Design a protein around this ligand. Structure first.
Ligand SMILES: C[C@@H]1CNc2c(cccc2S(=O)(=O)N[C@@H](CCCNC(=N)N)C(=O)N2CC[C@@H](C)C[C@@H]2C(=O)O)C1
Length: 284
């Protein structure tokens, strides 16, 4: 996308969201709290993936063009639970801040033309390459509240996706609500963890198409990956062109809020080839 990574209400407008300068600095602070209410238009690529019959929220996602939504394959397909949603079992709302409040002339809704899951998406073991692209029927117009997010390049992925560096999840606590055995848009900034540690922390076979984020718990923080939503986006603001890049789809995890457990994600850049191939050779 020629226009992405720049929020209409922020970067385009010289203003900067309260908690962002702790992302560029990747500098951790003296606070127990981590996530709270997210401000108006703080993430204009956030997409609400819905089930049709009955009506319910499934996953979060991301607008990348006026045509393509990006998400975790699991949201659409999981045969251990015979979960196979077709194009017309699902819909999307964009520009939503309040979970239960229609903002007039502001929020949009759309049905899907087609669904594209990854071919060697290993849903049989560890949800390898948990990625999926959704094409829209009627295309959406970018306003102040709807804007596409950027995709990483080789320089950005090498320079940003390292341990200690920080990223950000946004959602509506779907996850938290689903596995607690909540209202307006949530934002919680998490740091990237060492792949040596990611492995170490889980009994489950991980791949390079996967990375983890969270806090090692000898530095007691209340920063949990469950305040967002499944299939949601992981984003990191680049200090080389101000642009916000999506780095990892919220993939999977063990339990939720606990010491020395981290949210694993799809390695977006590592699959940059696939995503782009379908936009270049299928839509428009
Ligand atoms: C290979 C994975 C391993 N784990 C699981 C699987 C399936 C069902 C439930 C689990 S869970 O209990 O460990 N945890 C849930 C919820 C925890 C969310 N953690 C995060 N920090 N993201 C989960 O990972 N998943 C991912 C797979 C889907 C199918 C169910 C469920 C979810 O709703 O996100 C398959």
């Amino acid at each position: 996308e020629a226009d992405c990574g720049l929020r209409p209400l922020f970067e385009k407008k010289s203003l900067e969201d309260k908690t962002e300068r702790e992302l560029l600095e990747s500098y951790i602070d003296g606070r127990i709290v981590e996530g709270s209410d997210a401000e108006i238009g703080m993430s204009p690529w956030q997409v609400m993936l819905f089930r049709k019959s009955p009506q319910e929220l499934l996953c979060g996602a991301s607008l990348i063009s006026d045509r393509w939504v990006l998400t975790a394959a699991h949201c659409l397909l999981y045969p251990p639970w015979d979960k196979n949603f077709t194009e017309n079992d699902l819909l999307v709302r964009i520009g939503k801040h309040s979970r239960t409040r229609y903002e007039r002339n502001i929020e949009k809704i759309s049905m899907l033309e087609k669904i594209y899951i990854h071919p060697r998406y290993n849903w049989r073991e560890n949800l390898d390459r948990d990625i999926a692209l959704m094409k829209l029927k009627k295309p959406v117009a970018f306003s102040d509240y709807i804007h596409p997010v950027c995709l990483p390049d080789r320089e950005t992925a090498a320079s940003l996706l390292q341990a200690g560096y920080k990223g950000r999840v946004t959602g509506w606590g779907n996850l938290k609500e689903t596995w607690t055995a909540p209202s307006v848009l949530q934002v919680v900034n998490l740091p990237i963890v060492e792949r040596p540690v990611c492995k170490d922390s889980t009994r489950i076979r991980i791949t390079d198409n996967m990375f983890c984020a969270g806090y090692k718990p000898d530095e007691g923080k209340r920063g949990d990956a469950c305040e967002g939503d499944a299939g949601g986006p992981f984003v990191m603001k680049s200090p080389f062109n101000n642009r916000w890049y999506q780095m990892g789809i919220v993939s999977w995890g063990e339990g939720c809020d606990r010491d020395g457990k981290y949210g694993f994600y799809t390695h977006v850049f590592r699959l940059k080839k696939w995503i782009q191939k379908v936009i270049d050779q299928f839509g428009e």
